[PDB]
Paper text:
The mammalian antibacterial protein siderocalin (Scn), also known as lipocalin 2 ([name]), [name] ([name]) or 24p3, functions by sequestering iron as bacterial siderophore complexes. Scn tightly binds a variety of bacterial siderophores including many catechol-based compounds from enteric bacteria, such as enterobactin (Ent; equilibrium dissociation constant (KD)  = 0.4±0.1 nM), but does not bind many hydroxamate-based siderophores, such as desferrioxamine (DFO). Iron transport by Scn requires the presence of a siderophore, since Scn has no measurable affinity for iron alone. The importance of Scn in antibacterial defense was demonstrated with Scn knock-out mice, which are profoundly susceptible to bacterial infections.
In order to begin mapping interactions between Scn and cell-surface receptors mediating endocytosis and subsequent apoptosis, an anti-Scn antibody (R&D Systems MAB1857) was tested for the ability to affect IL-3 withdrawal-induced apoptosis in 32D.3 and FL5.12 cells and co-crystallized with murine Scn as an Fab fragment to determine its binding footprint on Scn. However, since Scn did not drive apoptosis in these cells in the above experiments, this analysis was not informative, though characterizing this interaction is useful for future studies of interactions between Scn and bona fide receptors.
Author numbering:
A (entry chain K): 1 to 132, 141 to 164, 168 to 191, 196 to 215
B (entry chain C): 1 to 66, 72 to 174
C (entry chain M): 1 to 211
Write the structure that this text describes.
């Protein structure tokens, strides 16, 4: 089966340089293009650039100055490096491929890598039990996004979008029941993983 | 009519260089989706001159025996080697016009891809250009394989009988 | 570049409605257009390529037509799982260019919210913090007002609302409202009220706790 996975640090200072790696599987870079498309929060999709099977590359003219797309054919890896970052480069960076046979249509996408361009540091959530039926989880003061919340490791529940207050994110999640459960909060960025049984 | 290829699938002479492509080209052979050897058979040769302007566009002038002068402006498109037709609004019969230099070595030959929409019909062709009026069978064969590659067949390929009248400028 | 004007920007649809997105290209693109579906959180997946060709996996209720500069995508019978953003793509030439997109929202029967209030945790209070949480769940339509009052003084400052994306299950929205407050200002007051008003509501819905 064809697979693409974006990876690399998902928090970058405005000063610094973004570096994402895309590890493809199910196909060869010799025979396929890999192109990066990005999507800022609540906005459309933007093609940034690409590396064709030939090894040659092309870029969005708006980013040619800053963007560099390379690859390692043997390791099945395609690399992105973008510099002179700004807050507005915050987005989900998708890894993608297009084949000659399909006339270079985009037919495979990675999961996408959240990239937050911020000067703010990483911080883990404190998780609080929310009890009075409906119960809740309060996940307070983490950075950057995202967190995944699950209940009883998958007995499904609403998880609301996080809101930003003073440089830190807060999120809540509810699960509804009758007889009456533990929260499962995870925070990739800070390798945090907590469980909050809510008693009472 | 066979469907037009995309500009991503049609090759693009890499680091195309306006400077070396300019000048006189002779149309050695032409191949395309409206061409019929069985009915058409062959055609008198004609020249095309690409005069590089300071815009970096070309003032393209085709000299044809009949002399008849077909003069157009080719404007550089998104990637070097690609062009559209300047002021297309002045051509009633043209709703789309793409030009793409598929392959050239600037000295001897070039294979250039022309696509267009007239009267709601989608046409396309590739000319075998040559800086001389004659070219190697390898290149004639190569050109054949190239148009076959685009979906065309042997009845879609045609070669020009050369002449001395008009086209030598 | 080739510019792609996609419309409408947003669409509201009842289940089983025929819906048609439309895209106009700045130049003719000789049928080299594709349509993508994107559910929130996931990537876009291709539905149709080359104007009208369905992918393995695309249900038949999806289709596309057009030629020249003008193209369209139609769902013949909208289902719950069709809820997403749809995008058109030109791939005739670089740069690849996507339409601005169509966010498709599903319409449904009115649904009155279930309002729950929560006092701060003993844990949070230990760390000198005090957030009061009010879940307003499974309402439709999307327009709603939540209010907070502390001892009868409408509390605006220190309140944040976020709302859920439409439920692919029952097509409702749910809202979470917090009131963030220090332990010490929390304890100066006793009565905390979460006051909701909605289309479905004949009277304000009010859940409260005394400290």
């Amino acid at each position: 089966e064809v697979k693409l996975q974006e990876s690399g640090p998902s928090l970058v200072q405005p000063s610094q340089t973004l570096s994402l790696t895309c590890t493809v599987s199910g196909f060869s870079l010799t025979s396929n293009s890999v192109h990066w498309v990005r999507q800022p929060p609540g906005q459309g999709l933007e093609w940034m650039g690409g590396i064709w099977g030939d090894g040659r590359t092309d870029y969005n003219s708006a980013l040619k100055s800053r963007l560099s797309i390379s690859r390692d054919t043997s390791k099945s890896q395609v690399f992105l490096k973008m510099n002179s970052l700004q807050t507005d480069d915050t987005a989900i960076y998708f890894c993608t491929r297009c084949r000659r046979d399909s006339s270079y249509v985009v037919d495979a996408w990675g999961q996408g890598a959240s990239v937050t361009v911020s000067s703010a540091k990483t911080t883990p959530k404190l998780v609080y039990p929310l009890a009075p039926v409906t119960l809740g989880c309060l996940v307070k003061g983490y950075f950057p996004e995202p967190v995944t919340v699950t209940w009883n490791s998958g007995a499904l529940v609403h998880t609301f979008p996080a809101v930003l207050q003073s440089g830190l994110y807060t999120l809540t999640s509810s699960v509804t029941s009758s007889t009456w459960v533990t929260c499962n909060v995870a925070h990739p960025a800070s390798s945090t993983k907590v469980d909050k049984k809510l008693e009472r | 009519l066979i469907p037009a290829p995309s500009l991503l699938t049609v090759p693009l002479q890499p680091d195309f260089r306006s400077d070396q492509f300019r000048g006189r080209w002779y149309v050695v052979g032409l191949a395309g989706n409206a061409v019929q050897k069985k009915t058409e058979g062959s055609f008198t040769m004609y020249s095309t001159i690409y005069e590089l302007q300071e815009n970096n566009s070309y003032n393209v002038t085709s000299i044809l025996v009949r002399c008849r002068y077909w003069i157009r402006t080719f404007v550089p498109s998104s990637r070097a080697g690609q062009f559209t037709l300047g002021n297309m609004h002045r051509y009633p019969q043209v709703q789309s016009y793409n030009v793409q230099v598929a392959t050239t070595d600037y000295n001897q030959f070039a294979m250039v891809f022309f696509r267009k929409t007239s009267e709601n019909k989608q046409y396309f062709k590739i000319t075998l250009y040559g800086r001389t009026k004659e070219l190697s069978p390898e290149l004639k064969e190569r050109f054949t394989r190239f148009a076959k590659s685009l979906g065309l067949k042997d009845d879609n390929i045609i070669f020009s009988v050369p002449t001395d009248q008009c086209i030598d400028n | 570049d080739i510019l792609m004007t996609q419309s409408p920007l947003s669409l509201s649809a009842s289940l089983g409605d025929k819906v048609t997105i439309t895209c106009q290209a700045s130049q003719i693109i000789y049928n080299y257009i594709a349509w993508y579906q994107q559910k929130p959180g996931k990537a876009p997946r291709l539905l149709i390529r080359y104007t009208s060709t369905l992918e393995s996996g695309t249900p038949s209720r999806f289709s596309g037509s057009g030629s020249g500069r003008d193209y369209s995508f139609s769902i013949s019978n909208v289902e719950s799982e069709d809820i997403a953003s749809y995008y058109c793509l030109q791939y005739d030439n670089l740069p690849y260019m996507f339409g601005a997109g169509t966010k498709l929202e599903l319409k449904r029967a009115d649904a009155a919210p279930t309002v729950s209030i929560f006092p701060p945790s003993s844990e949070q209070l230990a760390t000198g913090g005090a957030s009061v949480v009010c879940f307003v769940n499974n309402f439709y339509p999307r327009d709603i007002s939540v209010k907070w009052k502390i001892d009868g003084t409408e509390r605006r400052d220190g309140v944040l609302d976020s709302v859920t994306d439409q439920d692919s299950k029952d097509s409702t929205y749910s809202m979470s409202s917090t009131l963030s407050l220090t332990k010490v200002d929390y304890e100066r007051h006793n009565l905390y009220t979460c006051e909701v008003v909605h289309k479905t509501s004949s009277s304000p819905v009010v859940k409260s706790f005394n400290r």
